[PDB]
Design a protein around this nucleic acid. Structure first.
Lengths: 80, 102, 91, 95, 4, 92, 104, 81, 94, 4
DNA sequence: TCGGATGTATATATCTGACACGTGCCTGGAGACTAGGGAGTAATCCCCTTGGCGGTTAAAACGCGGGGGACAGCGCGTACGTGCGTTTAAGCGGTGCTAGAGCTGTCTACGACCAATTGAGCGGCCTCGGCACCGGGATTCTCGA
DNA sequence: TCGAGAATCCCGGTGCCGAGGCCGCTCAATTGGTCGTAGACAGCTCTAGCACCGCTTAAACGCACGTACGCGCTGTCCCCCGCGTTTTAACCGCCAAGGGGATTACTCCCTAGTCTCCAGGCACGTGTCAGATATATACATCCGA
């Protein structure tokens, strides 16, 4: 539903600035959208799989934490 | 209590029960809970000492995720320990490339 | 539900008598304790399996600690564990 | 007017010190729901679940941008580019 | 409590 | 008496590529691969059962772990094969 | 039938897999369909790998499979290479790639 | 045992770079390669020796080396496990 | 007399087609024993253990050189320099 | 069995 | 624009170390029966998610002018490939030896299991204190001469 | 080096939202005993890891050359950057509904355990075979002329 456009250009600029980046190319936003979309699918597939195994319908923060742990991206602060 | 006997702050009995119920092995020796609890307490004390130092340098008394992340990333050995670990609401270490600096 | 929050607070008052801690920080530290406990238990479990042994003991824990921890951290955690075990048996 | 290269440094210094979330919450929530649609239908989400998703995503993007900046500095540039992003990701071992 |  | 997947791997090779052989070092690599896949699947299944407060590991846990661990088409075919095997075994 | 593998129509050892699941401290109990499912998955993965290994062997005008063939088969397939992306096959070598700029 | 890093000769590094598909090599690559190889070897050997020490042995085994490699995320097939 | 780089491409072909070990066995073994001297004196080694060590080290170095080559190409160059290796190690996280 |  | 010298793929021999098949038999897999409890199913409640509304106002979108950095081209010097003659030690095949890995016997010290306590630890609740924000001044930067 | 113009830190008011401390209950940790077996320990075997030697010879080394290619520099130009204006929708309460998570209780069928026989699978034994060099020959393939 063209919701990936909601990750707007100034937000990607802010992320880059936090990453220490001084100059940005025009195509960086369109490439960053693809990268982020891929990462989100990779995590959400596992989270939804955990939810389906539990026989639930609400994806839980515990499901998201497990999905992140399975990919070597351990997250702290959400009941990890 | 086994924690007071061992001379610690962490729950040796709870750690023992977790070791026995985590399906790690068929049997658990009596000294293993003491060892694991001592290591856990030592690591917690390290993190909190460093984070309290960062909090004091920040002119604050309450340790917050930013202070914890600052302590962890400033300490090289602890950075190695918690390598692939995100700390929520922690931020990043302030650094800029010298070439980017004017 | 159970958590390491109270013991973490006790250690925090031992090391910094005048310092608080927010709930987000406590949740992060509770997660950290859980993660490190899981890692060390898993390594000692793998060791005991490699050795055709059915018991996790202080030697397995010490070896797991040495495998997981870098340099000074391992060298000091080993001393803490040894002291705790020595005192516990002596009492 | 402020010459180019000064406001960017000021923004870098500002955003490397604050710790808040840098992506708008309603757009991120909509994007997460739309992506999850392909795996299941009539799916609910916890607030903490969406928040954890945002935290992981923003941290991943910040790390990726840092490595992209290293690639740009290596190539004797100041401007990060899609070739920099792609090189960093492929060396990291994801593409 | 032997710290570094 | 050291057990290994030697005879089963050779039987599969006979059923898939009849008039072909296999060197012993390639056989060792195949054995290691089987042990690794078993360990990964069983570890994920155990972690899942612990998450769900279960005590027994079922074909449900095995199927979910296979989904989590394998890339898409591999996951489809492996799930198909597992379901077929359990169905035929139960029918028998 | 007699053997649990014959009932499931498999080649991998269902009873051996059941014993390994029981002895591995993965769980306190193990269901009776779990070893069947796991052995079926293992057999399918072995067949997937061995088919491509034999294909590479036949390409190289060979009748015997070697670690080089296993490496070629794994690294050429997009999904097997993803499953085994952090594995080092002994005596495997690497895929014969050359970057275009290096070529004259 | 001393000065044994030089057994990793310059032509050997050139051959490894060729298998990695490198067309041209700077002169100062060999010392850097020696350093990197030393660090990797030290990590792996320390883990393997820890395993042998825990097993009450004076002999380092292929199984111990394989366990060390798997621990570092460098799983190795062909030598059992 | 061949032009430079022709033998380089021929060697890339040869060593990317082959699969044998490219380091010398006795020097590598002496290096391994010397390195292990620092952890526990008077240690024995299985031949299988030393072979596994060598296979791991060769594979690791080959992959690292692949990444270094990519970095050098990214810098509009064809010669690999220690900066390429350092950058590859940083990005990989080592 | 049934391969891809 | 033709001729050449080096490497590579092709034909065939061989003697091999390696492997594909047959077998003793013993240990592990299968049968038969039960004992209990893990999990399924049903039912209830109330948390917490989802959907809508009205406003405000900060962030986003957009255009504009320019200057700064990306990029293409060019010239130079140096450093790396290439090839050849000389120096070295890896590799191979033995030969000897004893350390240490592995397997059998034993038998005791330690951990599992159970019944019964009693207290440490988990929720509810208050009350009040330090930091988020704002009003105002001063230091640290930049931008222009 | 020397002017002004902004951005932001520090000082003080302050208020307020949730953390630190305080109770009631309760289940889980402790304490005692009994008991089976895991593993420390002791001893005999036999493999294999280490050590010494002698010979090829293949790889490592040093050196001389020259040619491609890092590298600096100069100029063009286009493409981000900073900035002011209009436009969008996020955020913030706040309400309304109810789906589904989370809990308790009753069944009952699926798995652990145990005693038996009984062959599948390992170690052993053994005879044949695909091919790595070895020798010789034809086909590309750029490099000097």
């Amino acid at each position: 539903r063209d919701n990936i456009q909601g990750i707007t250009k100034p937000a990607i600029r802010r992320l880059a600035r936090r990453g220490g980046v001084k100059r940005i190319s025009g195509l960086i936003y369109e490439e960053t959208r693809g990268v982020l979309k891929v990462f989100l699918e990779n995590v959400i597939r596992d989270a939804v799989t955990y939810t389906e195994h539990a026989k639930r319908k609400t994806v839980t923060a515990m499901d998201v934490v497990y999905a992140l742990k399975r990919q070597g991206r351990t997250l702290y602060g959400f009941g990890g | 209590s086994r924690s007071s006997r061992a001379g610690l702050q962490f729950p040796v009995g709870r750690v023992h029960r977790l070791l026995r119920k985590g399906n790690y092995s068929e049997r658990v020796g009596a000294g293993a809970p003491v060892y694991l609890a001592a290591v856990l307490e030592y690591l917690t004390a390290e993190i909190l000492e460093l984070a309290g130092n960062a909090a004091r340098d920040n002119k604050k008394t309450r340790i917050i995720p930013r202070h914890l992340q600052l302590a962890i990333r400033n300490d090289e050995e602890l950075n190695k320990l918690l390598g692939r670990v995100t700390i929520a609401q922690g931020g990043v270490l302030p650094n800029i490339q010298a070439v980017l600096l004017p | 539900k159970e958590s390491y929050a109270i013991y973490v607070y006790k250690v925090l008052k031992q090391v910094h008598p005048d310092t608080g801690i927010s709930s987000k920080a406590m949740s992060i530290m509770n997660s950290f304790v859980n993660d490190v406990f899981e890692r060390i238990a898993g390594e000692a479990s793998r060791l005991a399996h490699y050795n055709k042994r059915s018991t996790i003991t202080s030697r397995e824990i010490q070896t797991a600690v040495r495998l997981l921890l870098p340099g000074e951290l391992a060298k000091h955690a080993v001393s803490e564990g040894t002291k705790a075990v020595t005192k516990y048996t002596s009492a | 007017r402020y010459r180019p290269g000064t406001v960017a440094l000021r923004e870098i210094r500002r955003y490397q010190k604050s710790t808040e979330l840098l992506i708008r919450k309603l757009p991120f929530q909509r994007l997460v729901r739309e992506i999850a649609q392909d795996f299941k239908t009539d799916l609910r989400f916890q607030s903490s679940a969406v928040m954890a998703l945002q935290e992981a995503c923003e941290a991943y993007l910040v790390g990726l941008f840092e490595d992209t900046n290293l690639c740009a500095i290596h190539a004797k540039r100041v401007t990060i580019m899609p070739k920099d992003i792609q090189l960093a990701r492929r060396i990291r071992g994801e593409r | 409590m032997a710290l570094r």
